[PDB]
Amino acid sequence: LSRLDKVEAEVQIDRLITGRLQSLQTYVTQQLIRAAEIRASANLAATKM
Amino acid sequence: LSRLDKVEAEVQIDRLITGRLQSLQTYVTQQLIRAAEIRASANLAATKM
């Protein structure tokens, strides 16, 4: 943003947005899968209690 | 499609395709994770029966 004007900057920014958004989607998806593992383990622990 | 010719339209259409396809992948992935939660609950319910 400090080095390029709006018409050229928005092209560069859209590349970062795309890759950063994909990085959050990858993280949140794996956290959802880990949450299921923890949920199953918590259900087992509640049954053991 | 009504406003741009093929060479320019396909560039704009590919942006929609990319984002809409990413929306379906996000939806189907979360449905697969929810299906596992429902599956675990159905297995529990079958055991309670």
Side-chain angles (χ1 to χ4, degrees), chain B residues 7-44:
Chain B
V7 175
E8 293 204 309
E10 289 185 346
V11 173
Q12 299 299 319
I13 300 289
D14 193 49
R15 276 190 166 278
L16 292 184
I17 289 171
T18 300
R20 289 176 179 194
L21 180 54
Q22 183 184 12
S23 300
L24 276 175
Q25 282 171 354
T26 299
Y27 171 79
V28 176
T29 298
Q30 290 182 8
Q31 289 307 105
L32 282 168
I33 294 166
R34 285 185 185 99
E37 297 166 22
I38 290 291
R39 182 62 178 154
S41 183
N43 292 164
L44 177 67

Side-chain angles (χ1 to χ4, degrees), chain A residues 3 6 8-10 13-14 17 23 25 30 33 35 40 43 45 48:
Chain A
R3 184 174 151 188
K6 182 179 170 193
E8 293 203 309
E10 289 185 346
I13 300 289
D14 193 49
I17 289 171
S23 300
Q25 282 171 354
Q30 290 182 8
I33 294 166
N43 292 164
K48 303 238 177 183

Side-chain angles (χ1 to χ4, degrees), chain A residues 24-36:
Chain A
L24 276 175
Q25 282 171 354
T26 299
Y27 171 79
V28 176
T29 298
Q30 290 182 8
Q31 289 307 105
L32 282 168
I33 294 166
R34 285 185 185 98

